[PDB]
RNA sequence: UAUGCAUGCAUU
RNA sequence: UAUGCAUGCAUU
């Protein structure tokens, strides 16, 4: 528990709505319209791991399409805010932004052309999830990838939703997450043939949904897309090393 | 690591106690077609710390039969004396298991198990006297040896021929015998459950026959690990976890 | 996010 | 025996 008081959450909603105006949810890069993403060379992944305050934020850059790690920054940080659903960015985003800036100063040539974020983008209680939030503050193209369904605007992990997951039969299969507004907030994606629990993909910034879904699918060796998976693995391994 | 002084004293103690091993049935329930009269099955296990070579947690459970509900638990932090050396497991875990037995007699003498499943081999052992025999001779309780991987002794090998046989195990309860180079039947490979492929290696501990030990092990398997051993392992690791 | 359980692989 | 990875479930 130890949730922030309502007055703090209310300020945070205001900041989310203001920055939401800067979200670009269409494609803005030439590689995004290419059938094989020709010209996409560098994909980023971000994640924060915790000690069972002390955390480890990690940014990786992977080559495309080989998905090999060409840059890694794993940093020990002291997080301030607690996890509250719908306010993830207020916990993780200042440190992720700080990693991007560190990359710009150390290997600016490895700046990623797109970033996969461990959390939703517009599939979010106010249409402005951590993936949008990182995208607006860095102006990088960002994809939101979530591991379970954020239940917003009528979306629910109920029987009907579970029935659709049964229709996902092969790697790459999708179905749209249709809000009560008639808006398509994201896609359920089956990562590969040997996984049944879908990923929940939504636009972060400067990318379209169908391109974000197709790209996430291409990063999936395992259920978790390789940029996120490598940041998660390396950040947790970094904690273990400086034993905790 | 122990000096050779201790090592030879250990080969000697094992041969000395081997003379008391009874590898036939001595309890009326063992001859019963449905094990009528068997009411209490024990399981023993010790968990270790990743950090401490010294600290360990030994646990003993007693389960009702045939419901397999835990009716007794004793979990104890202990100071290990010997390191793990293959073939001498008892000299590392068995003094603490004997102490758990003695404590049960003093606390709940009515829940004294009629048989004990041991996480480790019985007569399937470099000197025909594994930890399960060792506990059986020191307590005079009937004991079953259950191993999760094959102790390669007397020509037994986890080679291509052995792996073919494992493929021949098709359902829960399927078995094949483990024949040493002497032609002696040291144990049985048992498919524990329909939804596991990895066999158990079951051998006689004390005061039971192999056919009965195999059939009882199978009857205790909710999952791949027999429920008495499985419950001791879970409870002993949880105890280490909550003291870390 | 961390942890537990299940099934398998690897290391030991 | 502990850890890591994989797949699923649960708690959060
Ligand atoms: Mg994360
Ligand atoms: Mg993570
Ligand atoms: Mg054990
Ligand atoms: Mg164990
Ligand atoms: Mg995690
Ligand atoms: Mg273990
Ligand atoms: Na390319
Ligand atoms: Na009974």
A141: CATH? 3.30.2170.10
Q: By the 8 A CB rule, do A160 and A174 touch? A: no
Q: Which residues surround ligand 2, an ion (CB under 5 A)?
A: A 47, 232
Which H or E element spans position B45?
A: strand B40-48
| Residue B98: φ, ψ to 5° | -60, -40
Q: Per the structure block, which two tokens stand in for B144?
A: 């079953």
Task: Round to whole Å and give the CA distance between B174 and B200.
Answer: 11
> How many CA atoms, within 13 angstroms, populate the side-chain half-sphere of residue B226?
37
Q: Which residue has the tokens 């995208």?
A: A135
- The sheet carrying A54-63 orders its strands as A69-78, A54-63, A42-50, A114-118, A142-146, A199-205, A184-189, A174-178
Protein-contacted positions of strand D (CB under 7 Å): 1-9, 12
> For residue B45, what are the CA distances in angstroms to B14, B86, B167?
20, 16, 29
Q: How far apart are CA A239 and CA B46, in angstroms?
A: 27
Contact between A132 and A140 (Cβ < 8 Å): no
Q: Are strands B40-48 and B115-119 parallel, antiparallel or unpaired?
A: parallel
Q: Which long-range contacts (CB under 8 A, 24 or more apart) does A1-4 make?
A: A2/A82, A3/A82, A3/A84, A4/A81, A4/A82, A4/A84, A4/A87
Collect all residues with Cβ–Cβ distance below 8 Å to A208 and sequence separation of at least 6: A25, A26, A27, A32
Approach to solving: X-ray
Data resolution in angstroms: 2.4
User: Which residue's alpha carbon is at the shortest distance from the C1' of D2?
Assistant: B50
3-state secondary structure of B66: coil
**Torsion-angle region of A71 (φ positive above 0: left; ψ -120 to 50: alpha; else: beta):** beta
CA angle (B2, B4, B7) in 5-degree steps: 75
CA of B91 to C1' of D7 (A): 38
| Count of domains for chain B | 1
Name residues 208-237 of chain A with a Cβ under 7 Å from nucleic strand D: 222-224, 229, 233, 236-237
Nucleotides of C under 7 A from a protein CB: 1-9
Q: Which nucleotide is nearest to A191 (CA to C1')?
A: D7
How far apart, in whole angstroms, are the C-alpha atoms of residue A204 and residue A101?
A: 19
Dist. CA A177 → ligand 7 center (Å): 30
For the record, the structure tokens of B131 come out as 């930890």
Q: Are B220 and B116 in contact (CB under 8 A)?
A: no
Residues 6+ apart with CB under 8 A from B38: B29, B32, B65, B66, B114, B115, B216
* CA-to-CA dists, residue A122 to A189, B49, B102, B150, angstroms: 16, 44, 63, 53
> Is residue B225 helix, strand or coil?
coil
Q: Would you state the torsion angle of the CA atoms of residues B41, B36, B198, B80, taken in this order, to the nearest 10 degrees?
A: 10
Return the SS3 of A234. helix
Domain carrying residue A95: 1-244
DSSP B110: G
Angstrom CA distances, B62 to B67, B69, B108, stand at: 12, 8, 11
Residue B148 Cβ < 7 Å to strand C: no
* Residue the block writes with tokens 């590689």: A31
The answer to whether the CB of A82 falls within 8 A of the CB of A91 is yes
The C-alpha angle with vertex A180 and arms to A174 and A181, in degrees rounded to 5, equals: 100
């Amino acid at each position: 528990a130890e949730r922030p008081p309502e007055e703090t959450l209310s300020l945070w909603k205001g900041e989310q709505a203001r920055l939401k105006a800067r979200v670009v949810d269409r494609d803005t890069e030439a590689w995004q319209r290419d059938p094989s993403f020709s010209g996409l060379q560098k994909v980023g992944g971000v994640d924060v791991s915790f000690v069972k305050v002390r955390a480890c934020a990690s940014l990786v850059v992977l080559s495309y399409p080989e998905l090999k790690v060409v840059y890694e920054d794993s940093r020990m940080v002291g997080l301030k805010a607690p996890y509250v659903s719908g306010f993830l960015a207020f916990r993780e985003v200042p440190f992720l932004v700080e990693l991007v800036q560190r990359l710009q100063e150390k290997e600016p040539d490895l700046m990623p052309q797109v970033v996969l974020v461990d959390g939703n983008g517009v599939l979010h209680q106010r249409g402005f999830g951590v993936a949008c939030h990182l995208g607006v503050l860095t102006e990088l193209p960002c994809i939101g990838v979530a591991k379970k369904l954020l239940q917003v605007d009528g979306l629910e992990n109920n029987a009907l939703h579970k029935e659709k997951i049964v229709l996902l039969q092969a790697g790459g299969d999708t179905f749209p997450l249709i809000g009560s507004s008639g808006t398509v907030l994201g896609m359920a994606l089956r990562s590969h043939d040997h996984s049944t629990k879908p990923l929940y993909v939504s636009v972060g910034h400067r990318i379209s949904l169908e391109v974000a879904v197709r790209l996430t699918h291409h990063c999936c060796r395992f259920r978790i897309p390789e940029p996120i998976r490598q940041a998660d693995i390396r950040s947790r391994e970094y904690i273990r090393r400086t034993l905790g």
